Amino acid sequence: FRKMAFPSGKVEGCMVQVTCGTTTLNGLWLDDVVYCPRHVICTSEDMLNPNYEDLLIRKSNHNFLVQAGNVQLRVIGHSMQNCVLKLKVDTANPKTPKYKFVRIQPGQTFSVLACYNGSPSGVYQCAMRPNFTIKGSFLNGSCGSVGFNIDYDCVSFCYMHHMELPTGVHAGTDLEGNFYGPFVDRQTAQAAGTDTTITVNVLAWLYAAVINGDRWFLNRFTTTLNDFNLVAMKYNYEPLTQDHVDILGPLSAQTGIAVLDMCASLKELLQNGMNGRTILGSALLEDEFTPFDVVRQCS
Numbered sequence: 001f002r003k004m005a006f007p008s009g010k011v012e013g014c015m016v017q018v019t020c021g022t023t024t025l026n027g028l029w030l031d032d033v034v035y036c037p038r039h040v041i042c043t044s045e046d047m048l049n050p051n052y053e054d055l056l057i058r059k060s061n062h063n064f065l066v067q068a069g070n071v072q073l074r075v076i077g078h079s080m081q082n083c084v085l086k087l088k089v090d091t092a093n094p095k096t097p098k099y100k101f102v103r104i105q106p107g108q109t110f111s112v113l114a115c116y117n118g119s120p121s122g123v124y125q126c127a128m129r130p131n132f133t134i135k136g137s138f139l140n141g142s143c144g145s146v147g148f149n150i151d152y153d154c155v156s157f158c159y160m161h162h163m164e165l166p167t168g169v170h171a172g173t174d175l176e177g178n179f180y181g182p183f184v185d186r187q188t189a190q191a192a193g194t195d196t197t198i199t200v201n202v203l204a205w206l207y208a209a210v211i212n213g214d215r216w217f218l219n220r221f222t223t224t225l226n227d228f229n230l231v232a233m234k235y236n237y238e239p240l241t242q243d244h245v246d247i248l249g250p251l252s253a254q255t256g257i258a259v260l261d262m263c264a265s266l267k268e269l270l271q272n273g274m275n276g277r278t279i280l281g282s283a284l285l286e287d288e289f290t291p292f293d294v295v296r297q298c299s
């Protein structure tokens with residue numbers, strides 16, 4: 001059992017390099033618009049507290065260089081939308097996939113295509129944490145890398161990378177330029193909230209373990225939503241709702257294991273630990289697989 005990303009080809013053909021003066025980062029080219037982080041218009045002296053509006057007045061169309069590999073795009077308009085710039089270009093991307101922009105909820109997963117200088121370098125699976133950070137793997141130059149899901153033909157873009165916080169976790173926006181959580185595109189102290197564990201995801205992963213033949217943690221007990229939620233609170237797990245129970249319905253049905261029974265098994269794991277045993281080759285409880293992801297990789 002492994003985190004698996006979506007095939008990246010459809011997004012790879014959308015990545016470009018954006019340069020404003022001496023500042024370069026990655027952009028996303030869809031139809032005749034390139035999307036990128038607005039901090040492309042900054043220099044180092046700006047970063048403690050940029051006035052983006054004032055910085056952008058000194059910028060004309062020709063001050064943005066956009067390159068799609070070799071293909072050299074002509075910028076014919078620009079605007080700022082929240083924390084992204086939209087550069088209108090003369091040429092529609094011929095490789096534009098069917099796509100949508102979506103603002104995800106905490107707990108939801110997506111693939112990241114990490115890019116440097118407009119070139120794709122790696123793909124991996126990630127999650128929006130409850131505190132609205134993502135635990136990405138990004139180096140300097142990665143801004144403008146995107147997070148997405150692929151449903152049949154359609155690319156659903158949900159994340160654009162902006163910044164690494166001092167703690168080494170990552171913050172960024174939806175493709176409308178609104179940050180997830182309370183983060184801002186300046187270099188101030190921005191402490192994260194409690195990184196709580198995504199309970200419904202852990203349950204989904206326990207079901208995937210049963211589907212794949214790891215069953216040692218199935219115990220004799222059941223519990224109630226309220227009693228389980230006391231336990232979740234003590235262990236900094238998200239509260240489980242009836243909605244969560246409902247979305248676990250297919251996995252429950254497939255395995256014959258009532259969601260509240262699986263809850264009682266999780267309770268025991270939280271209270272007693274894993275006593276040196278593994279689940280799906282992991283020595284901790286994994287929370288970055290959704291119910292939806294589990295179905296994908298199991299059947």
Ligand SMILES: *C(=N)Cn1c(N2CC3(C2)CC(F)(F)C3)c(-c2ccc(F)c(Cl)c2)c(=O)n(-c2cncc(Cl)c2)c1=O
Nearest residue numbers: 025042043044138139140141142143163164185186187
């Ligand atoms: C991303 N392509 C470059 N970079 C930044 N940058 C780029 C600048 C801000 C320096 C500049 F030229 F003036 C504009 C940041 C960053 C730092 C502070 C801040 F408020 C923002 Cl909005 C961004 C950054 O964090 N990273 C980054 C991203 N992911 C991982 C790492 Cl190790 C660094 C970055 O590459």
